[PDB]
Amino acid sequence: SEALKILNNIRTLRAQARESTLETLEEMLEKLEVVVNERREEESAAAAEVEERTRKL
Amino acid sequence: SEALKILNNIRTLRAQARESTLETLEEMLEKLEVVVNERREEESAAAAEVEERTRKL
Numbered sequence: 001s002e003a004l005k006i007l008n009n010i011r012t013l014r015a016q017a018r019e020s021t022l023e024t025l026e027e028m029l030e031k032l033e034v035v036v037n038e039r040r041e042e043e044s045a046a047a048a049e050v051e052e053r054t055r056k057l
Numbered sequence: 058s059e060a061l062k063i064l065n066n067i068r069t070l071r072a073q074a075r076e077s078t079l080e081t082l083e084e085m086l087e088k089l090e091v092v093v094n095e096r097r098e099e100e101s102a103a104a105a106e107v108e109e110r111t112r113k114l
Contacts, residue, residue: 003094010083010090017082022074025082026067032089033067037060039096046103 006032063089 007013007028017024064070064085074081 003090003097010087022079025086029082029086030067033060036093039100040060043096
């Protein structure tokens with residue numbers, strides 16, 4: 001929901017921004033990368049931590 | 058690294074794209090949102106799972 005609303009989906013952005021500069025991305029895209037930036041470095045971490053064998057039901 | 062290189066940072070994008078349409082975001086930003094999209098729904102999950110008390114050293 002946050003990744004969808006962050007940029008509000010390129011579908012509407014490209015249009016609302018169509019009447020301006022791509023800076024819209026520098027606004028949303030720059031944060032859209034930072035949002036996943038944390039998730040990018042943490043998720044990889046979560047995957048390694050969880051592994052597969054470990055679970056304990 | 059993937060969130061940085063995905064869009065290659067708005068700093069360079071806004072410039073390389075400066076000579077074109079914002080579609081660049083629909084290209085990178087749309088995927089930048091999907092990338093975090095998975096992380097957005099999974100990370101929130103990882104946070105809840107990890108909690109704080111549980112750890113077992």
